[PDB]
Amino acid sequence: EYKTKVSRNSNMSKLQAGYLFPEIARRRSAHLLKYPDAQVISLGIGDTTEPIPEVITSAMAKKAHELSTIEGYSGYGAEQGAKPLRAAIAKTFYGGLGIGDDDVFVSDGAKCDISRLQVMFGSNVTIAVQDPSYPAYVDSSVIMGQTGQFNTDVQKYGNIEYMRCTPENGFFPDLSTVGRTDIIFFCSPNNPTGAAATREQLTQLVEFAKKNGSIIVYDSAYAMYMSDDNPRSIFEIPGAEEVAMETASFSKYAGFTGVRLGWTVIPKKLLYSDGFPVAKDFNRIICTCFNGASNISQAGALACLTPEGLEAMHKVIGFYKENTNIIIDTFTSLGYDVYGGKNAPYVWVHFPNQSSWDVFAEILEKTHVVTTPGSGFGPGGEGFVRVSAFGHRENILEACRRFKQLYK
């Protein structure tokens, strides 16, 4: 058979397996082959399940209709996003934090921004991540060439600072033990642990990044699930604007997982070591490597940031928060050390003395419930299982009775 003479990207070769979530989907498929008549309930991938509020979808349908009129048609937008949408995001989420409209970059969601930001930083930066954390930070790092080889002994790529977040440290890194890196990806409330950093901790994090001369990439995907009195934006920490940017999404707020709309904020005062503004390189990436978020998605996001839209999102979030309570109560009633599930739609359940992957297989096997194994979120996740709360109420309740029977 014919082969080209092009060498495979050696960074792609470094990757230890496929992406976590397709891997889980494979395993659930194999389970449906074994049990063809099983009633599978997925609490694995954190995908929203409830309909998008009408006020928002009417806004999208109206934009679609308008595209068939001479007056309403629009083509290429500003790749940063429509100005009224940047303004609404700037006012609504960062009002009083000194963020301008021109600091907001509208995207087709946060996973894409994470990789666009990794392209921008390039192959010579080193990164630190929460351990455990959402696997896209590590995987994108490997793909960009920022890392060594995977070491199977410790279960870690070389050259990544894994910042262990444990029950014994309150799921916040011990910063006095953390090596300096260029970038620090920091997710709060955290996926998978559910842990939301306090004001004092985030203060420490800014002080840490300021002294090490690092950039924090603050992932606030779950901030509007906040219950405790904790900061929802890193820019609430004075001095954050010199060391941090923030990336977020409408996915978990308006059910936009399929619709695709997020943003990144890069403050004017965030500068590389030569004084060059980081935002200006992001802007170049965004103009060259992207052609803007869908116009219909942007019209849906615009409608989200209005009194009716905010009320609708609060209702949605509230509903998933009530699912989370149900799951928490179940596991606590069962005598588990269960974490998170207060400030986030994830509960982080401790299964000590078992490997995550084995617990995943066991639950899937006995209860036809998909979970996500903790060690898919890095080596600090070993021994835990993340349980997602996105589901119809009846599905959540049924999964919980199934757990009660397995584990009684």
Ligand X SMILES: Cc1ncc(COP(=O)(O)O)c(CN[C@@H](CCC(=O)O)C(=O)O)c1O
Residues 345 to 404 in contact with a copy of itself, rule: CB under 8 A:
392
Please select the residue that binds ligand X; options are 129, 187, 243, 305, rule is CB under 6 A. 187
Q: Does 6 bind a copy of itself (CB under 8 A)?
A: yes
Residue number with CB closer to a copy of itself (120 or 363): 120
Q: To the nearest whole angstrom, how small is the minimum distance from the Cβ of residue 267 to a copy of itself?
A: 11
Q: Which does 310 bind (CB under 5 to 8 A by kind): ligand X, a copy of itself, none?
A: none
Residue by residue, what is the 3-state secondary structure of the chain? Answer: CCCCCCCCCHHHHHCCCCCHHHHHHHHHHHHHHHCCCCCCEECCCCCCCCCCCHHHHHHHHHHHHHCCCCCCCCCCCCCCCCHHHHHHHHHHHHCCCCCCHHHEEEECCHHHHHHHHHHHHCCCCCEEEEECCCCHHHHHHHHHCCCCCEECCCCEECCEEEEECCHHHCCCCCHHHCCCCCEEEEECCCCCCCCCCCHHHHHHHHHHHHHHCCEEEEECCCHHHCCCCCCCCHHHCCCHHHCEEEEEECHHHHCCCCCCCEEEECCCCCECCCCCEHHHHHHHHHHHCCCCCCHHHHHHHHHHCCHHHHHHHHHHHHHHHHHHHHHHHHHHHCCCCEEECCCCCEEEEECCCCCHHHHHHHHHHHHCEECEEHHHHCHHHCCEEEEECCCCHHHHHHHHHHHHHHHC
- The entry of ligand X, a copy of itself, none near residue 35 (CB within 5 to 8 angstroms by kind) is none
Question: Which of the stretches 59-67, 103-111, 138-146, 228-236 binds ligand X when contact is defined by CB under 6 A?
Answer: 103-111
User: Which does residue 191 touch among a copy of itself, ligand X, none (CB within 5 to 8 A, set by kind)?
Assistant: ligand X
74/291 with CB nearer ligand X: 291
- Is 251 an interacting residue with respect to ligand X (CB under 6 A)? yes
183 forms part of the interface with a copy of itself (CB under 8 A):
yes
The nearest distance, CB 209 to a copy of itself, in angstroms, is 8
Which of positions 282-321 make contact with a copy of itself (CB under 8 A)? 284-285, 287-297, 300
User: Cβ of residue 339: shortest distance to a copy of itself, in angstroms?
Assistant: 25
- When asked if residue 112 is in the footprint of a copy of itself (CB under 8 A), the reply is yes
Residue 318 interacting entry, from ligand X, a copy of itself, none, C-beta within 5 to 8 Å by type: none
Partner interacting with residue 221 (select from a copy of itself, ligand X, none; CB below 5-8 Å by kind): ligand X
Using rule CB under 6 A, residue 219 touches ligand X:
yes
Binding to a copy of itself by residue 100, rule CB under 8 A? no
CB of 71 to a copy of itself, least distance (A): 9
